[PDB]
Design a protein around this nucleic acid. Structure first.
Ligand SMILES: [Mg+2]
Ligand SMILES: [Mg+2]
Ligand SMILES: [Mg+2]
Ligand SMILES: [Mg+2]
Ligand SMILES: [Mg+2]
Ligand SMILES: [Mg+2]
Ligand SMILES: [Mg+2]
Ligand SMILES: [Mg+2]
Ligand SMILES: [Mg+2]
Ligand SMILES: [Mg+2]
Ligand SMILES: [Mg+2]
Ligand SMILES: [Mg+2]
Ligand SMILES: [Mg+2]
Ligand SMILES: [Mg+2]
Ligand SMILES: [Mg+2]
Ligand SMILES: [Mg+2]
Ligand SMILES: [Mg+2]
Ligand SMILES: [Mg+2]
Lengths: 116, 271, 65, 65, 88, 100
RNA sequence: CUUGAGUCUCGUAGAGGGGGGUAGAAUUCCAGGUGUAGCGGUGAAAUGCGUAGAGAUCUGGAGGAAUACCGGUGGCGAAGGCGGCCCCCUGGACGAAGACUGACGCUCAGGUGCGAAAGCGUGGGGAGCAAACAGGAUUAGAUACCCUGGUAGUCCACGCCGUAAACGAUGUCGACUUGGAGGUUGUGCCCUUGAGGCGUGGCUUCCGGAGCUAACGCGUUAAGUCGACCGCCUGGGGAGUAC
């Protein structure tokens, strides 16, 4: 539970769910909180408010570390990629940058066929 | 090439032959032969220890230079030859000092090719050199498992081992069975795949083919009596038993490797 | 898209979710979602080409405005 | 206005990364001639030069290496 | 292919002079040189159907020029086919 | 004998060996009457992406006019040599000795 | 004989083809670290994965497939079709100026070759996707759509098939007949007194005149006006089946 200053707030925002894991600058995770664990089961899980709540609930359990400044790594589509940043800053974290880490292939693997 | 025999008679209908027109159509090199008497599968005690062996054609043993420990001296592949002991063909080579030696014939080895061995050799297929001077990822054959041992991996026809990793004293090798094995990097390895890569396409046509290759018939366990085999008995094709070897041990899936002294080398096992 | 941070936050988050559509990522992962068969690729491209040919050079009308 | 046909470079050097960086984005994507003017022949030369510079790592494929 | 030097050598060898480059003998000799050349390319690139299409166009062109030469002057026709190594 | 153009990076610890590398290769090229035109040893450049857990390689550009077997043996040397990283031969069909 | 058709010199553009080698992104798996109760999915769920520690995040390795951006009613190709970069072998097309042969041309029954995808055989390969299959839903039922997995197959080598809404539903070749706006690739000259203006070629996209058409529409790349040769059609089913 040692004190660290430079943490990174990784956000795996997707369509159904969003996952906000806060790691140190090497990738050791401090704490995580998803939209599905904060209540919000089903359609609620996929709203910006659920991601806001998840980012708030992850700004806790990382208080034992004294995190001051944060790198935000938004990864993926979905509504919980611009509300989670606002909720992380409304928690008292000075943001150092915002970086989109969404995996973009270069025509690599073939996607699922299609819904219908 | 792969030649399919014409069905001018049964037992000739289903044959497929591998005619290698580059093999020497003459007597092999004499000073490198020695007699190889058949066994029948019978051990020191006269008893059959491995079944389904006996008969077949006479064949002399060709002294193949598996070690390739004549470093620095170049060699010219004088002749390609048929070996009755291997599935692959052998290659009589002549060194620049006047010494003839049988080697395994890699894929790209025709007559007159210039090979050699040693720490400073090139990376042409057929050139032996310890697996430190060999670049990683390259395709080698006739790999040694101990330095100076002689070479034991990838020496069947069309077979090769691949150098996957290289960690200090050791090298990881994807073997022809998919298993990744660590051998020390002082061990030698000839470059390129082994020749006669179409050997697996012959289909032998008939029973006498296997018979003169030296393979006595295989009686199914069910075709026996309960005293003869764990399978057997039954008033007409009854099995009802779990498949086992003639000595009781499970077959059709039961891992029987118990070495516990070479497990330090097997990074990961057969698929 | 590594938007380093200036002071006022959505003075910079604005240039984050305005650079996201300059790089067009949140709409680039909508083609990569499902596999669109090459016929449909070509057909959608051709229909976008034909739509782009909306004759904006034909807007000299009165319409009593 | 195609500041390549403005000059007649006659071949876009992939070692001129000083001018190649003018035709990528902060994410390293090539910028379309529909924006940069860039007569089509020189746009093709430019894309090949960008790709060779990427291979030689004079330029980045993406901003996430 | 069939570089400027080789085709000019064939022109000088098979024509009235080096300026005479459109005569039937020179056209046929150039097509024959190209065909003998490309035999090696199609020895291993068996699946080069798009290039073999042009090769067969060359073969048919050479045959049409040879028919013209035959029914135009049989002496030149025989001389050219024997000097060039033709007829199967 | 066609006009090539060869850009190859090398490990930034055998940067001391880049002279011997360069003169060795140019001597091999001149041996078959290949003509070196440009020999711009670019020094230690910083890479845009890390090649083999390693930034900051050492570039060498050289424009030659040599036959195919020369350039192919050269490519094999680049491959089997452990310090040469991301070689790149190219056709250029001319004589380019200007800059960069 | 040269106005057709070819050859040669220089040059240009191009995912044209065949072979080989590499690059990066990403998916997946494996080994390890942090960390923890969720993940995943949907219309909603559930199957499913997860405290045996998943998901998330970082490091290392393996492996296969496809090449983001450029990217364009852009290009090339007889059609099928072909897009990371590099090299090797190779086909075609076009332009300017000239010489060269001198009708050597057009078409083509039969024949021959190429011919998407699926499929078949042998041998490899197998990341992802996914017929079949299994389970969960939906349902009146659901051997469907939807979800979770998943095998051939998709990949490679060599053979076989020889078919597609293989389609501009428009055979090839040639000649002639108002125009407009483009795209692309050549080329000549003029003030280049810039990236401009003025012409001349190849391919190409859209609109439209005469004319044609049952109309829709085509409209110098005609479905307009003609010539050559070929293929085909003769009410709808049966049937493109049967033998
Ligand atoms: Mg047996
Ligand atoms: Mg048997
Ligand atoms: Mg039996
Ligand atoms: Mg019995
Ligand atoms: Mg018993
Ligand atoms: Mg009985
Ligand atoms: Mg019975
Ligand atoms: Mg005349
Ligand atoms: Mg016909
Ligand atoms: Mg075929
Ligand atoms: Mg197929
Ligand atoms: Mg198959
Ligand atoms: Mg499914
Ligand atoms: Mg049909
Ligand atoms: Mg089609
Ligand atoms: Mg039709
Ligand atoms: Mg019209
Ligand atoms: Mg039928």
């Amino acid at each position: 539970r040692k004190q660290v200053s430079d943490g990174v707030a990784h956000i795996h925002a997707s369509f159904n769910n969003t996952i906000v894991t806060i790691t140190d600058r090497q990738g050791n995770a401090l704490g995580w909180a998803t939209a599905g664990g904060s209540g919000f089961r089903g359609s609620r899980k996929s709203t910006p408010f659920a991601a806001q709540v998840a980012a708030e609930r992850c700004a806790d359990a990382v208080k034992e570390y004294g995190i001051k400044n944060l790198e935000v790594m938004v990864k993926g589509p979905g509504p919980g990629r611009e509300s989670t940043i606002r909720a992380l800053n409304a928690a008292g974290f000075r943001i150092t940058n915002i970086t989109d880490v969404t995996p973009i292939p270069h025509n690599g693997c073939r996607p699922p066929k299609k819904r219908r | 090439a792969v030649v399919k025999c014409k069905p001018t008679s049964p037992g000739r209908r289903h044959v497929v032959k591998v005619v290698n027109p580059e093999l020497h159509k003459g007597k092999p090199f004499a000073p490198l032969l020695e007699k190889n008497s058949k066994s029948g599968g019978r051990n020191n005690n006269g008893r059959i220890t491995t079944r389904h062996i006996g008969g077949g054609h006479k064949q002399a043993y060709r002294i193949v230079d598996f070690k390739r420990n004549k470093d620095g001296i170049p060699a010219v592949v004088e002749r390609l030859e048929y070996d009755p002991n291997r599935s692959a063909n052998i290659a009589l080579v002549l060194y620049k000092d006047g010494e003839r030696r049988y080697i395994l014939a890699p894929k790209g080895l025709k007559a007159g090719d210039q090979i050699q061995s040693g720490v400073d050799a090139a990376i042409k297929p057929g050139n032996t050199l310890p697996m430190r001077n060999i670049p990683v990822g390259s395709t080698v054959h006739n790999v040694e498992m101990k330095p100076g041992k002689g070479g034991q991996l990838a020496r069947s026809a069309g077979t090769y081992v691949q150098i996957v990793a290289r960690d200090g004293a050791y090298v990881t090798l994807r073997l022809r069975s998919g298993e990744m094995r660590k051998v020390e990097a002082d061990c030698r390895a000839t470059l390129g795949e082994v020749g006669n890569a179409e050997h697996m396409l012959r289909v032998l046509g008939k029973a006498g083919a296997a018979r003169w290759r030296g393979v006595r018939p295989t009686v199914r366990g069910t075709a026996m009596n309960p005293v003869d085999h764990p399978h057997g008995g039954g008033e007409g094709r009854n099995f009802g038993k779990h498949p086992v070897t003639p000595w009781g041990v499970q077959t059709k899936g039961k891992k029987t490797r118990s070495n516990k002294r070479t497990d330090k080398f097997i990074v990961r096992r057969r698929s | 898209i590594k938007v380093r941070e200036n002071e006022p936050f959505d003075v910079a988050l604005r240039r984050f979710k305005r650079s996201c559509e300059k790089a067009g990522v949140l709409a680039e992962v909508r083609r990569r979602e499902f596999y669109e068969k090459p016929t449909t690729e070509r057909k959608r491209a051709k229909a976008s080409a034909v739509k782009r040919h909306a004759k904006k050079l034909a807007r000299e009308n009165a319409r009593r405005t | 206005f195609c500041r390549f046909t403005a000059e007649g470079v006659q071949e876009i050097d992939y070692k001129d990364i000083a001018t190649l960086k003018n035709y990528i984005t902060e994410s390293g994507k090539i910028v379309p001639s529909r924006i940069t003017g860039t007569r089509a022949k020189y746009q093709r030369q430019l894309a090949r030069a960008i790709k060779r510079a990427r291979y030689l790592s004079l330029l980045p494929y993406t901003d996430r290496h | 292919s069939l570089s400027t030097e080789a085709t000019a050598k064939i022109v000088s060898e098979f024509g009235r002079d080096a300026n005479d480059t459109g005569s039937t003998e020179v056209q046929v000799a150039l097509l024959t040189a190209q065909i003998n050349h490309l035999q090696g390319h199609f020895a291993e690139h068996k699946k080069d159907h798009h290039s073999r299409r042009g090769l067969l166009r060359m073969v048919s062109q050479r045959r049409k020029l040879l028919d013209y030469l035959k029914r135009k002057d049989v002496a030149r026709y025989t001389q050219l086919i024997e000097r060039l190594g033709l007829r199967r | 004998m066609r006009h090539y153009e060869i850009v190859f990076m090398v490990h930034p610890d055998q940067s001391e060996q880049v002279p011997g590398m360069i003169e060795r290769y140019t001597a091999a090229i001149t041996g078959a009457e290949g003509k070196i035109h440009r020999l711009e040893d670019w020094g230690r450049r910083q890479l845009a992406y890390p090649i083999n857990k390693l930034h900051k390689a050492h570039y060498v550009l050289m424009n030659v006019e040599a036959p195919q077997e020369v350039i192919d043996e050269l490519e094999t040397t680049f491959r089997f040599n452990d310090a040469v990283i991301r070689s790149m031969v190219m056709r250029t069909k001319h004589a380019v000795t200007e800059a960069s």
